Amino acid sequence: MLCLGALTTLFTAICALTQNDIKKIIAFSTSSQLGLMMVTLGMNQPHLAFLHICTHAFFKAMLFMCSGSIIHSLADEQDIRKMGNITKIMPFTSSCLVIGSLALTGMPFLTGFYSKDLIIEAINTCNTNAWALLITLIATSMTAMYSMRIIYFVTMTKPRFPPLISINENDPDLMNPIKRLAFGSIFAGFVISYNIPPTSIPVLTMPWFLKTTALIISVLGFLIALELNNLTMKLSMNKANPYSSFSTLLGFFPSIIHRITPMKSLNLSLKTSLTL
């Protein structure tokens, strides 16, 4: 469970990097945090995995609903390369989306802390496997990275969307639900953690570079993504790599398996089975 969850948490995180569709980015965020929870089950700490379930719910709901507001506002277009300057043209959606991204990262008091802090504390205070620790930490950094990627390419740069502006954030069937999920994503982890009965005993006697490792590494991922997404603003013809396509494509796992495995299956199902 540990090794598999850590593999997922690395893979889907590095694959979210260099994705343009928002919905796929949030999907890989789900997969990454879910790999983190399976990593938690890799040790005898499942209740913390369940806290992460209950907290992940609010983040993902709010993020997808902010995305859907951004989408249905303009046409069906879902890709950050044509989204532009959303801090200003949609203040409400941007505010809620940034709250959700910050809480997805281990921000210290927004329901992502109340699990993820204990998660990383547990995983660097356990004697299981070092590669899993390392790649989960890298994956947390990558969480900060792609959150910053959305916040940059969607919410900070200049407009890339078409010039006919038909935005309407004003509808009570839109603002009230994300408002409820925002009060959730700010309060519910505090409430739950301070109301549940104590189980899955925590360890907290340890150096300072382990109690602040999630905060440090998330901040550092934010810094790296900010710098690297500023690097594209200047003029220089960037090139494809052997990297950046293992991420853009999904390690070629679909592009291989989904066209060999059904190929051999169906060929063996016609010939060698029916017509033989």
Binding site: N44, N127, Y194, P197, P198, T199, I201, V203, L204, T205
Partner: protein, 111 residues
């Protein structure tokens, strides 16, 4: 950082996380006081504790649960109780690290 010391250099004298009571308990100890419990078995059971949870520091947990039940609204009522449980558990963890370092210093006594 106490893993370099066995995987990279100076191996086979640093302790394994298993077999931590390798040497006998009373080596170098002329007298010994065994650890005590204050939460008896019936209290510790009837409070419906989990097996991982009913260690030497269970009495402060019982106190915390008494708080969290009686003063249920105002779930922020007793933080001092959780502080006492956390403090006793920190001291248990310090005893555990102390046994580690005892065994570490004693594997150097051999050589």
């Amino acid at each position: 950082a106490h893993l370099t010391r066995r995987y990279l250099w100076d191996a086979s004298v640093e302790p394994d996380p298993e077999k931590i009571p390798s040497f006998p308990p009373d080596l170098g100890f002329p007298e010994r006081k065994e650890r005590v419990m204050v939460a008896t078995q019936q209290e510790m059971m009837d409070a419906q504790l989990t097996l991982q949870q009913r260690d030497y520091c269970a009495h402060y947990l019982i106190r915390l649960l008494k708080c969290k039940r009686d003063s249920f609204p105002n779930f922020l009522a007793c933080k001092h109780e959780q502080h006492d449980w956390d403090y006793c558990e920190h001291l248990d963890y310090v005893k555990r690290m102390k046994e580690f370092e005892r065994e570490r210093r004693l594997l150097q006594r051999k050589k």
